[PDB]
Symmetry: C11
């Protein structure tokens, strides 16, 4: 199953997981401080991922940056 | 399953999931504020995704941009 | 796990039309896009062909093609 | 499962689906007007596709053009 | 999910002949193409070999080849 | 499943299927005259293919030529 | 299943496994000292990994560096 | 499933199929005259193939040439 | 499964397997003397591998070096 | 399943298949003379292959050459 | 399933299988003299392979050389 790499470029970045299934809501928000990296898969419980805050992101489709 | 990356280039962008199945309707709209990124899969419940508003989108077939 | 098509409307009133899978072929849904909206649409248990009408920039795994209104 | 892209270069381009199975005949003809695009899969019901008329065609093996 | 061949007729009366899969081998269908028409034909449960007669431009996963009439 | 493309470069080329299994024998010989093309799979019944006669051959390993008699 | 390579560039780097499932929490934190390498899979129990401290990281998507 | 192409560069090239299983011996020998081509798979009954005589051979790992 | 290559660049390099499962602990420590090479899979019992000591390592993701 | 290509570069080359399982021993030694090519798979019964004698070898990882005593 | 190629560069090189399973111990040591080549899979019984002595090694990750 595929994954996303997120590197926080500032304190307070949120990596938020969205529920798989008929309904869509946030079930977890992981806080990243500056320089921390999270590598996060899609899973049985998480079919969409939202990033809030400034971070460097890598996926299979290349690099993108949130602000 | 494939996924799409959507980065909102202005406030109020909507990423809209359309129902899988014989019926087609919107089941969810995720609102993105400028500079937020959403990485969203195709799923048992979502077989088409629509984006409204200004955004930079990546998929397996490359970059495309939506404009508001 | 199926393939998908990206459609970006280059004018108002673009229609992305889904054709039914199976022995019966007909249109079952027509999605209206206005200028600059994007639809990323899979082939599905219900949709085995997709017709685009109106001016649009389309990406498939075979590359770019453009429809003209 | 594979698909063919068909872009009509004139009115009345006919995309013809041939039946899968021991018998071969057409079971559907989808006409396209100039500039419309049809992205059609091979399926449980369609194992060969014929294009009549002027059309620009993409498949996994590259581009080909039909002449009407 | 089988492979498919692309056949473009370069003259009228090209024949794309499907041969039967299985222990026995015979022609089960000849699809006749006129000049400029394109047939995209899979290998299937019933067709394990395809013969082209007449002048045609052909694409398969191993490249381009041309039949001559 | 893999296939081979055979284009006859003279009359009377044979494309010969050998039986799959513990027994090996020819079960079919498809005659090609000049300019005809056969695109033939490996199958539940054919696990080896012999070409006799002058032909241009494509497989997934590239181009090979058989030389006639 | 995919894996991530982490080389500690300073002492006390923490590679933290997050639980797979409805619940998300840290179930393990592996401490690496300077110059140690950990190569770590996604698994039945671990569906996200977090690195804290200065490290050089390789994944399928290329190289990235965490900072302390 | 993999296959080899064998082109005979002289008369009487011998393509030898070795039996798959705990035992090894040849179960079939197909002779090729000069210029003939055999395209042969690995199968339930053949798990090694030997070529005797001058032949031009292609496999997934490139070209090799047997000499008589 | 994926495997890692580890070449000891000094004596007493440790290639340590961490248990797969809810619990994470060392189950095995393989000591390599200078110049020895260990080629080691991920497996039913081992879902993370830690290298301590100076070594040259190859993974699908490319080269990395652990240092003493 | 993977296979290795072995071309003998002198008489008397041996390609030795080692048994798959907890037990490791030689179950078969195929003797090759100069110029002959063996294309051998890994199998239910053979999980390692040893080559003794001068030979030119191809595998998915590239060319390697065995040298005889 | 993958394999590794080992060419011995001097006499008495040892290619050592380590047991798959909860337990890790040797199980078999194949001695290669100079110039001999062994091509060995990962298997139900072997999940790690050690090379001791001077040898040229190829894996899917490239060339590496052990030193005695
Ligand atoms: N609960 C939704 C979440 C989702 C995934 N991808 C989306 C795309 C758009 C909107 C919502 C979603 C689902 O599993 O289908
Ligand atoms: N409910 C439709 C939604 C859909 C997916 N792709 C489409 C293409 C065109 C029109 C509708 C669609 C389906 O699951 O098949
Ligand atoms: N209902 C038809 C639709 C179709 C798909 N590809 C086509 C090509 C030509 C004509 C019809 C089709 C099918 O599922 O087979
Ligand atoms: N009914 C035929 C259609 C077909 C597919 N490919 C062909 C090639 C030649 C002739 C007919 C065909 C089949 O399913 O096999
Ligand atoms: N009925 C034969 C047709 C065939 C396929 N490939 C061939 C190659 C040679 C001769 C015959 C064939 C089969 O299914 O096997
Ligand atoms: N009956 C043999 C035919 C064959 C395939 N590949 C071969 C290679 C050599 C000799 C015979 C063969 C089989 O199916 O195994
Ligand atoms: N017992 C843990 C080991 C592990 C794998 N990857 C990790 C990443 C971080 C922390 C622990 C791990 C598991 O199988 O999941
Ligand atoms: N327990 C969560 C952990 C997780 C994986 N990826 C995520 C992305 C965002 C938030 C949480 C996660 C899950 O398996 O789904
Ligand atoms: N009967 C043997 C034939 C064989 C395949 N590859 C080999 C390599 C070496 C020696 C014999 C073999 C087997 O199926 O395993
Ligand atoms: N019987 C052993 C053969 C073997 C394969 N790979 C090896 C590597 C080293 C030593 C022995 C082996 C096994 O199947 O596992
Ligand atoms: N018996 C161990 C062998 C092993 C494979 N990879 C390793 C890495 C480190 C330590 C031991 C191992 C296992 O099957 O898991």
């Amino acid at each position: 199953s595929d994954f996303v790499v997120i590197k926080a470029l500032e304190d307070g970045v949120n990596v938020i997981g969205l529920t798989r299934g008929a309904d869509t809501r946030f079930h977890h928000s992981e806080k990243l401080d500056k320089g921390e990296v999270l590598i996060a898969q899609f899973t049985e419980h998480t079919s969409a991922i939202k990033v809030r805050g400034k971070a460097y992101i890598q996926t299979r489709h290349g690099v993108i940056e949130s602000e």
